[PDB]
């Protein structure tokens with residue numbers, strides 16, 4: 001049976017890098033393909049980038065308990081979420097599964113699939129995260145303050161997760177995640 005790992009963290013401690021490294025390291029890793037009700041962009045392939053479904057069908061899936069989690073995107077322009085069945089089928093086939101979501105999505109997945117392993121990717125320090133959020137300083141004081149407040153709230157509840165991987169260095173953080181996925 002394949003492990004299911006749920007990767008989350010602060011909304012900007014940086015995850016598309018770690019995900020890329022993980023997919024290169026584990027040749028048959030299944031990266032969960034979310035359902036959405038927006039339309040495809042040119043270049044997007046149904047079943048690969050998203051599972052493109054229509055608003056009516058998505059509501060069916062909600063009511064039948066077929067989403068591990070879902071949310072309204074841009075205040076309800078459309079919806080996106082994680083489908084239970086592909087994840088369960090991949091795991092029963094023996095293939096490891098990675099789900100990458102925001103913190104609210106990860107909290108919801110722990111309820112619908114408790115055997116999933118939740119991992120919070122933390123920064124090596126507060127000062128490290130703060131420097132990245134100031135960045136080049138092209139954002140106003142009010143926006144930066146709001147991002148610093150948001151990060152503190154999100155960091156303060158890393159205890160709800162099963163595992164904390166501290167992102168000190170790409171190669172060791174990615175190594176720790178490989179151990180969880182195929183160990």
Ligand SMILES: Nc1nc2c(ncn2[C@@H]2O[C@H](COP(=O)(O)OP(=O)(O)O)[C@@H](O)[C@H]2O)c(=O)[nH]1
Pocket residue numbers: 034035069070071073080081082101102105
């Ligand atoms: N909770 C939930 N949100 C999702 C899911 N997939 C994508 N989203 C959100 O939809 C938004 C925009 O999607 P898009 O611009 O195509 O690229 P993305 O941001 O990397 O997913 C992001 O804020 C995501 O957090 C999902 O499976 N579940």
